[PDB]
Structures are given as structure tokens and as C-alpha cells.
Amino acid sequence: RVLATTHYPELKAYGYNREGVMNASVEFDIETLSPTYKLLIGVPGRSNAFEISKRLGLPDHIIGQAKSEMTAEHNEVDTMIASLEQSKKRAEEELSET
Amino acid sequence: FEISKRLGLPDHIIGQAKSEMTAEHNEVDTMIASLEQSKKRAEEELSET
Numbered sequence: 001r002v003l004a005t006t007h008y009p010e011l012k013a014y015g016y017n018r019e020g021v022m023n024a025s026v027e028f029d030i031e032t033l034s035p036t037y038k039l040l041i042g043v044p045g046r047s048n049a050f051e052i053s054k055r056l057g058l059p060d061h062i063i064g065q066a067k068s069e070m071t072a073e074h075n076e077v078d079t080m081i082a083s084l085e086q087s088k089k090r091a092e093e094e095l096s097e098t
Numbered sequence: 099f100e101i102s103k104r105l106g107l108p109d110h111i112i113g114q115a116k117s118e119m120t121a122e123h124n125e126v127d128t129m130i131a132s133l134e135q136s137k138k139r140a141e142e143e144l145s146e147t
Binding site for chain 1: 128129132136137140147
């Protein structure tokens, strides 16, 4: 029985390529810049470095240049996780009203 | 790898790890399939809610 932790964009994908392996993450709230400590089984962890940097005042031209040094696949993955996570947030908020 | 080998890490793990440096992007497409499926489920659950 194995539980492992990583911050590497390789291992973001590790478990989906494997039988009997789960990929998970622990949720972060960028709007408070605080961890929610909530374990998301099945959902892998997006990186938010630029969004945190913007919320801390880093200039948009530096973020725009750094995002141009990234691969096309990197920018898709963290955006897809953000769209999933926002859809989950919407489901949770609309459920709390319900 | 040279440090890990010297500390006693087995040669088959080091051999395999030099291929784990290329065990990439096909994993990410398989991850993306799980991302889109998880998004689709969250939208179905929202529609039910």
C-alpha cells in the first residue's frame, strides 16, 4: 500500500498511465492564497505560480513572457484542471444553496 | 543517478529511471482523458443538482 507526494509535472500524469494507481491532489484556494487541505481523489494538482505571482503584484509582461517559455501541453493541463475544479466549485456552491 | 547508485540504489531502478525520463506526454494525454471525464461528471452532477 503506497501513498506518495510530488510537485513534478511528469508525476501529475503518473497514475493515469498505470493499472492499480490513483492520482490525487490537495486543494489550494488562489483567491485567499491559502490551502483548503481538501484531498481530491482522481483530480491531479494544477500549478498556479503565475496566478499567485499576479495576485502578489508581478507585472503582466513578465508573466506573459514566462508563459511563452512553457510547452503547449503544460498550458492545456493546468487550464483543464482549473475548468474541472471550477465546475466542481459550481456543483458544491449550487448544492449548498440546494 | 551516480549518487543514487553509490548509495546502493539497485541498477535495474537506475536503468528503468533513465527510461522514466522519457515516460512522458502519453501519460499526460491519459491524464487529460481523466480531467475531461471528471469535468463531464461535475457538469452532470451540477445538472442533477
